[PDB]
With several copies, the nearest count.
Chain A
Amino acid sequence: APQSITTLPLQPDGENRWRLPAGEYQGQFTIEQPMQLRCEPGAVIQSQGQGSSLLISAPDVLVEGCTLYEWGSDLTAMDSAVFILPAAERAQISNNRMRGPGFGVFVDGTRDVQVIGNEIDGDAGVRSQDRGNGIHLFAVSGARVLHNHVRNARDGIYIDTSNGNHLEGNVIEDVRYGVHYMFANENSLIDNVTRRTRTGYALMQSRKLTVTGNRSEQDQNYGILMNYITYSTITGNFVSDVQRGDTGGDSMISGGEGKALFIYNSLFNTIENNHFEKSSLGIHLTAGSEDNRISGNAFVGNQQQVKYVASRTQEWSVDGRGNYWSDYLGWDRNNDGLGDIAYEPNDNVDRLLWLYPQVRLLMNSPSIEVLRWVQRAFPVIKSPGVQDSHPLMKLPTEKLLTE
């Protein structure tokens, strides 16, 4: 593993500057001095296949423009394209292109690191299990991951046991999980984009994070999976078309149903102003999530909008603001009274109002109307507990529909 003191330095003045001319630099490389390696538009570091293309082991290193190919395959030795050691604080990895069967950027407990504007690609030859993560973060703090494209590398970007992170603008495509995210307290995710994944946002076992402004496109099996996520400010998200596990001649009877929001055990959040659309289910609520504040959301075109299971009563309407509730059947007689009927969810009517969209007309007839008036007075179908006292007739989240 020769160092960057080898090859062609062409040093600019200031000594915190080492340019890099074009060419086929073949092998691995280790950074052991404070450097700012800024290279020309096209230079290629071709690691034949043995891993550890760049081992940054010194503080204050800034790598810009580099292109990396086929760095490694062995996950056991966590071979990556960039492997920032814990003592390489304040490192910056900007505007690099990386295509290899393994980790793209790996920060191992090094604080105040900046991974900006990197397009990471992975080969499709290897199976999804052995592709290797992208932008893996361990015990990191103060870091900022902005506008990094990662494609075809399992688990999108991964955060573990980290507190000081600020995430923005990531365009994650064709990965197993959009953001795999475990035991990461007091973080922040903004304006992320996950497409064609198998879990758009895995918000696991964490605390006091902000997931404002994110955006999940045609994902699969999950849109926003939240486990034990407390004291958070979930806002601004957009989840669309979370397809199920349907490949080949099979049917996962009573399973595999996609979910826009899988909210689990998360007692305290501030979920508001989110758009969940064209899903196979929304706001799946299990365990205990009392004291959570849900308002101003939008659920359109869902096969079943909610699957509340707890035996307690919880109103998702803080300060007279509910959710758009496409299934909501009629009734906005005061001009702005948000609604008179509380949206008591029925799973069966949700299925009808999605497959047959004209049934709303059929259920606005005065006869069916008085029947419903008698079915909201003498309960028929035991109350799935959720009930929005003040549902919404106008459709909010219009700003974030298409952006």
Chain B
Amino acid sequence: DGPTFAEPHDCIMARRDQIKTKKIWDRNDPFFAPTVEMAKKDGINLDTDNKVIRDGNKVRVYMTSMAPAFGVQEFTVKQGDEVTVTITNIDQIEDVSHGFVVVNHGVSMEISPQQTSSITFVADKPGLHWYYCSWFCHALHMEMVGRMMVEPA
């Protein structure tokens, strides 16, 4: 017997042989083809570059993340800018997944190996906002932190 929450209405079954998965992502995967296209719009290679672009009130932060250190550990933005953190995993070891959590901004993502994820959020509160890594990925997980320096208006 088993307890399942929130009423699973139905179920489907498959054999282990029938279902084949991917240990790590590819980088031709359609899932995040839009974001890669955005990188082309800026001439940014997500694989190795760690740059901050800033046009008007839109700041984009392309970066690479490999355990236990973010590629960009500080980006300075002014208040009221939609900051689009675009972070790629350059780690090829299976199960080593990283996270991006901005403290007090309601921003959390998971990043599997060789995955690219981008979140847009507004830097409403001016000041120094630590952002850490959610998914434990390395022994010195403690230092997989970065500081976002949001300039007062």
Contacts and interface: CB of A to CB of B under 8 A. Distances in A.
B140 A288 contact: no
Contacts of A227: 139
Interface of chain A, main secondary structure:
strand
Interface string A225-249: 0011010000000000000000000
Contacts of B140: 182-183, 205
Interface residues on B, range: under 10
Given A182-B139, A183-B140, A204-B139, A228 B68 contact: no
Nearest to B140: A183
B138 A228 contact: yes
Chain B binding surface SS class? loop
A288 B139 contact: no
B73 to A, nearest CB: 14
A267 interface: yes
Given A227-B139, A228-B138, A183 B68 contact: yes
A46 interface: no
Interface string B120-139: 00000000000000000011
B93 interface: yes
Nearest to B91: A230
Nearest to A231: B92
A270 interface: no
B94 A267 contact: yes
Contacts, number: 22
Given A182-B139, A205-B140, A265 B68 contact: no
Contacts of B138: 205, 228
Interface string A200-239: 0000110000000000000000000001101000000000
Nearest to A267: B93
Interface in A253-293: 265, 267, 288, 290
B139 A205 contact: yes
Contacts of A290: 94
Contacts of B68: 183
Contacts of A265: 93
Nearest to B138: A205
Contacts of A288: 93-95
B93 A230 contact: yes
Counting chain A CB atoms within 10 Å of each CB, the highest count among B92, B93, B138, B140 belongs to B93
A294 to B, nearest CB: 17
Interface in B92-144: 92-95, 138-140
Contacts of B139: 182-183, 204-205, 227-228
Interface string B66-96: 0010000000000000000000000011110
Contacts of B93: 228, 230, 265, 267, 288
Interface string A178-206: 00001100000000000000000000110
Contacts of B92: 267
Nearest to A290: B94
Contacts of A228: 93, 138-139
A316 to B, nearest CB: 19
Contacts of B94: 267, 288, 290
Interface of B: 68, 92-95, 138-140
18 contacts: A182-B139, A182-B140, A183-B139, A183-B140, A205-B138, A205-B139, A205-B140, A227-B139, A228-B93, A228-B138, A230-B93, A265-B93, A267-B92, A267-B93, A267-B94, A288-B93, A288-B94, A290-B94
Given A183-B140, A205-B138, A227-B139, 12 more contacts: A182-B139, A182-B140, A183-B139, A205-B139, A205-B140, A228-B93, A230-B93, A265-B93, A267-B92, A267-B93, A288-B93, A288-B95
Q: 10 smallest A-B Cβ distances: which pairs?
A: A205-B139, A267-B93, A288-B94, A183-B140, A205-B138, A230-B93, A288-B95, A204-B139, A205-B140, A267-B94
